[PDB]
Design a protein around this ligand. Structure first.
Ligand SMILES: O=c1[nH]c(=O)c2nn[nH]c2[nH]1
Ligand SMILES: O=c1[nH]c(=O)c2nn[nH]c2[nH]1
Ligand SMILES: O=c1[nH]c(=O)c2nn[nH]c2[nH]1
Ligand SMILES: O=c1[nH]c(=O)c2nn[nH]c2[nH]1
Ligand code: NA
Ligand code: NA
Ligand code: NA
Ligand code: NA
Lengths: 295, 295, 295, 295
């Protein structure tokens, strides 16, 4: 037998950083969960009990805190690139670093219509994420994403004209509820190294904001023919607005809300045009994926 | 042996209701999870396998949907009171109904600075809850609550002057992070029945809004001497603003963020006045409770 | 306003303890999650920012580890009583301690039909729990429980003869699946203090084992007329086997498995006597409770 | 823009099946959660709102139940292969099916030392899983796995001799706790189609049992030099015992248990050789992966 692939590191490293403005007294907080996995010439730790090649996972944890102390943690694309680059430059035998960051929301509170200097609220479990792969000699690959954005529209969704055969019981519909949890990922063109990532720093927050805005507006305004059709419209718009993106991937559950026939009870009408009360279904759920790139 | 207490019913009943405005085309959605447990002269179902006294839990589920079809589902205090009253009036041998409702957030989307007619976002896992106990001959007891409101302030929290003995290692501090998940419950004076609950309908949403506003403002503005002291200030304000409330209960975790000493690494300064990077602790957590009533 | 009730302490304190046998080399591990909440003359911490009355929650955490170091941690009824007694005896102004312990399973591995000296497996998320309330002048109240015991029987469960009215759609049945997660709690007679708890130490593990055995055997063997009827049989047996128990409480979800009618597809028969494939329902679920005491 | 990749289907489909033995009266239950995602000539559903190419996800759900009715559901490798093959054969334009199955434990109860005919217990959240990719013209690729196997050993784990630099604070150790949740995956050689999968049916359960046995025995008996070294020993043994496996992948968290220094309290000794009470850490955790193949 032989080691075909190996990676190891530290997962679930929670990090908080505060920035304090001297002049204004305003404080800004950032909270993330970080995972770093390393690859390189480490096979002998597995095959020969040779620990000399192991940068301890505990040391990886220390490095994450030290790096956060000495560098900006925002945008996360930059922080992840700094962190990954550190490992491949510091350790001769480490040749790839894989950095995953999940950013948690701490949104500044409005108290009496004024933004508060040091108080924050977690407005939703929506996350902003990055995956950064730093590979020696091959540059920096960054995938940025938003996840956990949960939306619902109560009308202007349709689903008809699908394949009907002996396995089909679903009725066609011209008016249904559509609800999903949005997972959207945009993959940047490969960057040659840290200097190039630094050169594009303003694009990272702007593109995240664009992706979120396009997702919300398209969902709200499309008279949706299917999840498939609406998601494609979202992806093509993001690609049009940011030339440094190579692909956009969406993964959308279809979280079903079923009509409840109440006609057995005193002829109560609660279906079709008379549907008011529905039963949200926890499972199963449709799952629709697509990756859209350039022609 | 004897049955000392018994209750049974249906839990985790998910309900969605849509309201459609004829004139304006605006739609409004409500989504809840409902539990109904009944008590009464039902001991023989346990002791004698006498099912004749059992209103099937499946029928309780049907009743919840039918009641939501025929009545407003908001405010939840009203819906819960209607639902509980139904059971004690319909069934001679049922003498108490216990209704728990959790309301999930579906907040109308703003698209281009305009509220959208039929699109919604789940902005946070904060819930609004009610517990309604309808007891034959004894009226309607309602406890209203908010839960899952997660906040953090990065300064203006202190904790010093506590008891120090041979079990104590905690350093006194004049500047720390304070973060919590707010659970706040206000208990209404007993209502004589449904007519009285109806008479106070406008107070329910207003008091919820007040409780939320007082909680956020007090948290943000108090130079906190302890969780204990800040929570008491919140409770006394709510009691002052709504005379129909008898008690307010808060239950607050203290979600700790620890300083990280980095001085072992090149004398890096990251404690006290120099603290920038902290380690959020998943566990353990302080837990502080108090119930405040009138003198 | 006035403080009507207050308690505070430390939750989610994870503790592991190992015992090493000198002679045999056998090791035994215990892992628990502990919560301790205190009550007493502490109102001024809430009302006057007087921290002098506060035993810091951090110190409570330290105390839990120190107490586990100096005392047996099994049975948990004993450990909880030692821990609660410590607080009311050490601190003049603390008058009640509330201790909740959850015990996690670490079951010794069998390797080649021989018990291994120091290797363990988590065989299920079933827990053994205790709630110990130590109240100055009023002794020690202990509630012991098992939870998270998930079982299913595929036949020998019935449900017919229930109330039928205009809200009822459920068909009577003489053969259904019954599945539940067992939560069972037995409440001990009040103990005068630690000496009395020590005197009954052997009864704690024995009664837990009895409660578990009676629950499993009764579930497996009863031709169940309802959840209500089967649960009562369990409770009456436990009360008969241990005279120091005052009440037994069961709380059982009814986790539904629905028949799937496939007759629309080529006349496929999958209902009643021909039912083979079922759809487990995540929600809603029946919830049936009862507390059984002595005549 | 262009569709680069697309797949869609139904996730979280819960399925239960019962087998009833005519002669003996013994019943056996199987419960699974199934996901099926399809690929093929479906781009126009995304780009042109052409639903004619969509096999509705609801129909996929129906197909899963029908297939479970008409076929064995065990071993899951076989069921997944039958299910995936159905889609590529039935629908001209569907060219790949991806089937993921999670099998839940229902272990027959022993009552009075005798196996019960129809009563079952969920003994742990350990799962047996399969991923089956059926690709038209390219055969059937099967990855089998176990997950959620949680183990701990209280001694006979070491970790010393690792890289030490200015980022390192970890002390070397010759005696520590090792605890992990095992995720192990074995990838079968490609099968030409369903006939070949059928020909190897007995190997599937046998190899699962072998993988589990090798994992438990190696964990218990290895005087572990690191997670890396112990996991490699497991993988090489599985590859040696089953020639039809091409690779074995392990993914292991290192779930840390920290010593607690109590020496500040009355010189209490709780470190090194005197360590009895430890603090389980919820996060962060080491994460160690490796894929082992043939030379
Ligand atoms: O077994 C281990 N492997 C590692 O890579 C490591 N790093 N810190 N502790 C560790 N333990
Ligand atoms: O065992 C049962 N008890 C009940 O109260 C009930 N109601 N519906 N089905 C039921 N099954
Ligand atoms: O606000 C606090 N209250 C307390 O009771 C406490 N104990 N430790 N830290 C604390 N902080
Ligand atoms: O939007 C949808 N896409 C689909 O593929 C599908 N299948 N059933 N319902 C559906 N809705
Ligand atoms: Na390198
Ligand atoms: Na009544
Ligand atoms: Na006392
Ligand atoms: Na095909």
């Amino acid at each position: 037998s032989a080691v075909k692939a190996a990676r190891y590191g530290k997962d679930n490293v929670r990090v908080y950083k505060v920035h304090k403005d001297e002049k204004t007294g305003v404080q800004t907080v950032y909270e993330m969960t970080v995972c770093v996995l390393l690859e390189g010439e480490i096979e002998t730790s597995y095959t020969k009990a040779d620990n000399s090649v192991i940068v301890a996972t505990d040391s990886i944890k220390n490095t994450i805190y030290i790096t956060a102390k000495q560098n900006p943690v925002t945008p996360p694309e930059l922080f992840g690139s700094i962190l990954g680059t550190h490992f491949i430059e510091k350790y001769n035998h480490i040749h790839a670093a894989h950095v995953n960051i999940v950013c948690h929301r701490w949104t500044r509170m409005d108290i009496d219509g004024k933004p508060h200097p040091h108080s924050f609220i977690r407005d939703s479990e929506e996350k902003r994420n990055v995956q950064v792969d730093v590979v020696e000699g091959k540059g920096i690959d960054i995938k940025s994403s938003l996840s956990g954005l949960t939306v619902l529209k109560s009308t202007n969704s349709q689903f008809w004209g699908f394949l009907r055969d002996e396995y089909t019981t679903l009725k066609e519909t011209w008016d249904r509820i559509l609800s999903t949890d949005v997972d959207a990922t945009w993959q940047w063109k490969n960057f040659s190294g840290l200097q190039e990532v630094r050169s594009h720093v303003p694009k990272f927050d702007a593109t995240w904001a664009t992706a979120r805005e396009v997702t919300l507006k398209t969902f709200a305004e499309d008279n949706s023919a299917s999840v498939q059709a609406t998601m494609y419209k979202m992806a093509e718009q993001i690609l049009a607005r940011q030339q440094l993106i190579e692909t956009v991937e969406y993964s959308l559950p279809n979280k079903h809300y079923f009509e409840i026939d109440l006609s057995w009870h005193k002829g109560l009408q609660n279906t079709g045009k008379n549907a008011e009360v529905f039963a949200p279904q926890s499972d199963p759920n449709g799952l629709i994926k697509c990756t859209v790139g350039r022609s």
